C-alpha cells in the first residue's frame, strides 16, 4: 500500500544461473530478501510485508513481478554452462584426528568413494550464462534497490549454497507500461490458467515461497527468454 510505479530492474550477471524448470520471478527474490531482513520465516509475515513494496494483484493472486529474462549484448549472448558441485574428501577429512574409523587387523577400513552411501557426489546441473538479467515489477524502487543490493539473494536456484546467479550493478529504471504480468496477451509470469493468458502450462504455486503450498495449474512463460540489452534500456 503505497505509490507504486512500474519499474524495470537490470542487473549484471556474474555467475551462471540455474533455472528450476520455471524461470525465477522477482517476487521470489524479494521474498527471500525480506525473509532475511525480517528475522522471520513465516510466509504470512513476509508476504504481509512484501505487499508493502510490491503491488499485489488480487484478481489473479500474483505479485506484479515478472519472471527472469536474460539480456544479451552483441558482445555476449545466452550460453550453456553446467553448475558443478563435488565432494572434496581431503586427507584432513580422511584422518583419524577427525573420526575413529572401524579397524580390521589394525588397518583402518577405507571409505568406499566410487559408490555407495559415501561416494564422491559429482552433481552437475544445467546453467545459463548471459551478460544481464532483467525483471519487471511495480513497487517501491527504494526498497527493492536496498533489498537487491544488501540482502543475500541471487537469481536462480540455490544461491545460498552454490552462489549461482550472483549479480551486481543493480540498475532500476522507470517504465511507461506495466509489463510485469501480461504483454500482448502472453503471460510474463506464473499466472492462473483461467486468466486467459498464453504460455507454457505447468503446476506451481502463485505466491512465494514457490516450494511451499498447493500447486495449482498455472500458465508461465518460457523459462529461457532473451532480449537485447539495447531494447531493454529503451523503457
Amino acid at each position: 500500500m503505497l505509490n507504486f510505479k512500474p519499474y524495470r530492474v537490470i542487473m549484471s550477471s556474474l555467475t551462471p544461473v540455474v533455472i528450476s524448470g520455471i524461470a525465477p520471478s522477482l517476487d521470489g527474490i524479494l521474498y527471500e530478501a525480506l525473509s532475511q531482513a525480517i528475522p522471520s520465516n513465516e510466509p504470512g509475515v513476509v508476504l504481509a510485508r512484501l505487499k508493502e513494496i510490491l503491488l499485489f494483484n488480487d484478481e489473479l493472486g500474483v505479485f506484479h513481478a515478472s519472471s527472469l529474462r536474460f539480456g544479451i549484448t552483441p558482445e555476449q549472448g545466452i550460453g550453456a554452462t553446467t553448475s558443478m558441485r563435488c565432494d572434496y574428501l581431503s586427507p584432513e577429512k580422511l584422518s583419524t584426528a577427525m573420526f575413529s574409523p572401524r579397524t580390521r587387523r589394525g588397518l583402518f577400513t577405507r571409505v568406499l568413494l566410487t559408490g555407495g552411501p559415501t561416494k564422491r557426489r559429482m552433481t552437475t546441473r544445467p546453467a545459463y550464462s548471459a551478460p544481464y538479467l532483467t525483471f519487471d515489477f511495480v513497487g517501491s524502487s527504494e526498497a527493492v534497490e536496498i533489498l537487491l543490493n544488501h540482502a543475500h539473494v541471487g537469481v536462480g536456484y540455490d544461491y545460498f549454497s552454490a552462489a549461482n546467479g550472483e549479480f551486481n550493478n543493480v540498475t532500476i529504471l522507470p517504465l511507461d507500461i506495466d509489463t510485469s504480468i501480461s504483454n500482448e496477451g502472453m503471460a510474463l509470469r506464473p499466472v492462473p490458467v483461467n486468466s486467459g493468458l498464453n504460455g507454457i502450462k505447468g503446476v506451481s504455486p502463485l505466491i512465494p515461497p514457490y516450494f511451499v503450498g498447493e500447486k495449482l495449474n498455472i500458465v508461465h512463460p518460457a523459462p529461457v527468454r532473451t532480449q537485447l540489452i539495447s531494447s531493454l534500456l529503451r523503457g
Partner: protein, 341 residues
C-alpha cells in the same frame, strides 16, 4: 534471531586458483567464467563454502576433544553428517516437506548443521563468490618444465654406480625413441582430424575408429617402455590464477543467526586465519589470502543496515572489532548443551 551480512574484500597474497571440471578444457586450464574466454573469471563460492565448512568442522572437533583412549568420539556416520551433510546409515530425521521452520531442536543442538545444512535441512550460511574488482587481475601462472636431475647437475653422476649410470642411459634412449614414435602417431592422428571435417557422413565412423586405434597404439607403445612408462622431461602446463595482490569482492550471510551459530561462524573464521588459503596448487603456496569483512545486520522493523563490527584477517593476526561479535563468540564458547553426535 537476526541476519548477519558479511560484506568485504579478499586480497590474494599469492595467486589464487581452482580447478573446475567444466572450465578446464583440453586446450588449457582456465578459471570459471560466466561466458566466453573474454568474460571476467570468478572464484567459486562453493570452494569458499567448502573451506569454511571444513574450518567449522575442525572447530567442532577441537571443542569436543578426544575420548579417554585418545580416539575421536565421532564415527564415520557422524563424520559425514558434519563434513558432507549426507546420512549414510539412514538414521537422520526426515522432516515433513510442508513446513519450513523444521529441525528447531536439531538446529539448537548442532550449530554446525544449522549453519551449513544437511540433506533435508537448509543451512543458514550463505557464502558468495569472490568477484574480482579490476580487469587484468588474472594470469597464467605455474608453468615450468620438469627436467632430468642428472643432465642438469653433473655432480650427481658421481654418486651413481656403473649399473645405475647404464640404467639412466637406457632410460634416456627409451624416452627419446618413444617420443619420436608417439610424435609420428600423433602426426597421423592429426592428419586424420584435419580431413575429418571434409569426410563424408558414412566416413564419419571409420575415421573415428582409426583415431581410437591410434590412441591405443600410443598406449601400447608407452606400455612397451621398460625403464620408465612416462617421459621424465616434459613441459608443465600452466594454470590460470588470480594475480598476487588481487582484490576480490566477497559477500557472506547468516540467515536467522542465533548468538551461538554466529559465534561458531566467527570461530571458524578465526581458525580459518591460521591457514587462510583457498583453492589448490598449494605446492606453489597458491591460495593464501587476507580478507576483511564488515559484519552488518538489518535494523529491526525497517530496511536500514546496521553495522555491528568488522573482522580483519591479516598475516599478522585477526582483529575482531565490535562488542556484538565478541558477545557471539562468548555465547558459543559458554554453551554447554551442544551434541554433535
Amino acid at each position: 534471531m537476526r541476519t548477519l551480512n558479511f560484506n568485504g574484500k579478499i586480497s590474494t597474497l599469492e595467486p589464487l586458483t581452482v580447478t573446475v571440471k567444466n572450465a578446464v578444457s583440453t586446450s588449457g586450464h582456465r578459471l570459471p567464467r560466466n561466458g566466453g574466454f573474454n568474460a571476467a573469471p570468478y572464484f567459486p563460492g562453493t570452494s569458499i563454502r567448502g573451506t569454511l565448512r571444513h574450518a567449522a568442522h575442525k572447530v567442532i572437533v577441537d571443542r569436543v576433544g578426544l575420548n579417554a583412549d585418545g580416539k575421536s568420539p565421532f564415527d564415520l556416520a557422524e563424520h559425514f553428517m558434519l563434513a558432507q551433510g549426507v546420512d549414510i546409515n539412514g538414521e537422520a530425521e526426515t522432516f515433513a516437506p510442508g513446513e519450513i521452520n523444521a529441525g528447531a531442536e536439531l538446529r539448537s543442538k548442532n550449530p554446525l548443521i544449522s549453519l551449513f545444512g544437511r540433506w533435508g535441512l537448509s543451512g543458514k550460511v550463505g557464502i558468495g563468490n569472490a568477484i574480482p574488482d579490476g580487469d587484468n587481475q588474472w594470469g597464467m601462472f605455474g608453468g615450468g618444465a620438469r627436467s632430468i636431475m642428472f643432465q642438469r647437475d653433473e655432480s650427481l653422476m658421481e654418486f651413481l654406480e656403473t649399473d645405475q649410470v647404464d640404467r639412466l642411459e637406457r632410460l634416456l634412449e627409451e624416452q627419446a625413441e618413444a617420443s619420436v614414435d608417439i610424435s609420428q602417431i600423433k602426426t597421423e592422428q592429426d592428419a586424420l582430424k584435419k580431413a575429418m571435417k571434409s569426410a563424408d557422413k558414412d566416413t564419419k565412423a571409420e575415421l573415428q575408429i582409426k583415431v581410437r586405434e591410434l590412441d591405443e597404439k600410443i598406449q601400447a607403445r608407452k606400455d612397451q617402455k621398460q625403464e620408465s612408462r612416462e617421459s621424465i622431461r616434459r613441459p608443465i602446463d600452466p594454470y590460470e590464477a588470480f594475480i598476487t595482490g588481487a582484490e576480490l569482492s566477497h559477500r557472506m550471510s547468516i540467515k536467522n543467526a542465533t548468538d551461538e551459530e554466529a559465534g561458531l561462524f566467527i570461530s571458524a573464521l578465526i581458525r580459518f586465519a591460521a591457514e587462510p588459503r583457498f583453492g589448490g596448487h598449494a605446492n606453489h603456496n597458491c591460495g593464501l589470502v587476507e580478507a576483511h569483512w564488515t559484519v552488518t545486520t538489518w535494523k529491526p522493523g525497517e530496511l536500514v543496515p546496521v553495522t555491528l563490527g568488522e573482522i580483519v584477517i591479516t598475516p599478522n593476526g585477526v582483529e575482531i572489532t565490535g562488542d556484538e561479535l565478541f558477545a557471539m563468540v562468548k555465547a558459543f564458547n559458554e554453551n554447554q548443551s551442544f551434541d554433535f553426535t
